[PDB]
Amino acid sequence: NLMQFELLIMKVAGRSGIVWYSDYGCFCGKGGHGRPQDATDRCCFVHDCCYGKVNGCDPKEDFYRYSSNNGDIVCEANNPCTKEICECDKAAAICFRDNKDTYDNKYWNIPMESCQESEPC
Amino acid sequence: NLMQFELLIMKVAGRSGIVWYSDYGCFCGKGGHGRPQDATDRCCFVHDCCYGKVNGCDPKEDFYRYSSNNGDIVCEANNPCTKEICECDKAAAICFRDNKDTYDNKYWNIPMESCQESEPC
Questions:
Q1: How many Cα atoms sit within 13 Å of A72 on the Cβ side?
Q2: What interhelical angle do A2-13 and A80-98 show, nearest 10?
Q3: How far apart (Å, rounded) are the C-alpha atoms in residues A40 and A104?
Q4: What distance in Å separates the CA atoms of residue B85 and residue B75, rounded to the nearest whole number?
Q5: CA angle A90-A93-A97, nearest 5°?
Q6: Residue B90 in contact with residue B75, Cβ under 8 Å?
Q7: CA–CA distance, A75 with A90 (Å, rounded to integer)
Q8: Which cystines does this chain contain (chains A, B)?
Q9: CA angle (B51 as vertex; B73, B5 as ends), nearest 5
Q10: Chain-chain contact of B18 with A29 (C-beta, under 8 angstroms)
């Protein structure tokens, strides 16, 4: 569930997803569409796509089980569907962390005109 | 800031915004198109519109000052722009609270085809 995603972002990237990644580019935030603007934005695009590939459970709603060790997330294999959700969230959190050097407020609150026809997954 | 919106929702409505309102109707965790599907969805629509009227500060990002006693939210008059953000978030949290009894999973994950109509603010 997206609260768990927030927690993983905090554990892995050392910053809040809701604070910093909720209005970024074309995909980090609600109503994502268009083309990813930078690496951080692509992290969100990939996350959306990852969620779209999860079948048999609800990736935006269902809770998953995981452990965290000093910023290292282990998605538990108690249920392959919810593990898939967890792996989506873990991957996105890692992607935000790995691209922290190009995070840029240039991409905050960008005009509607910047996000039009969507890159397909 | 959206983290503060979460705090207001949690206190006022008694449940998490990120958990329960990230994929509801055409506007809760989505937006940009459609007509509100029920009263909860309309809360989100109105919140989007409210944010749309904010001039001079960034409603998704900027932090506001508020106090809370016995579950009330008093948006501080230290800055009219951030107070306006606060009031938007407060109104939405109240709206979620007031409509919690009709909150229904009927409106989870609705197809894009259900959100093609356009309703102005």
A1: 2
A2: 40
A3: 9
A4: 9
A5: 135
A6: yes
A7: 8
A8: 26-115, 28-44, 43-95, 49-121, 50-88, 57-81, 75-86
A9: 35
A10: no
- Residue B64's region, left for phi above 0, alpha for psi from -120 to 50, else beta, is beta
Write the burial class of residue A62 (CB in 10 Å: 0-12 exposed, 13-18 middle, 19+ buried): middle
For chain B, the residues whose C-beta falls within 8 A of a C-beta of chain A are 1-3, 6, 16, 18-19, 22-23, 29-32, 58, 60-61, 108-109
Q: Which two tokens stand for residue A15?
A: 């910053």
Closest in B3, B19, B29 to A3, CB measured: B19
Instruction: Record the resolution, in angstroms.
Output: 1.6
In chain A, the domains with their CATH numbers are 1-121 (1.20.90.10)
Cβ-defined contact of B108 to A18 (cutoff 8 Å): no
B47 among known catalytic residues: yes
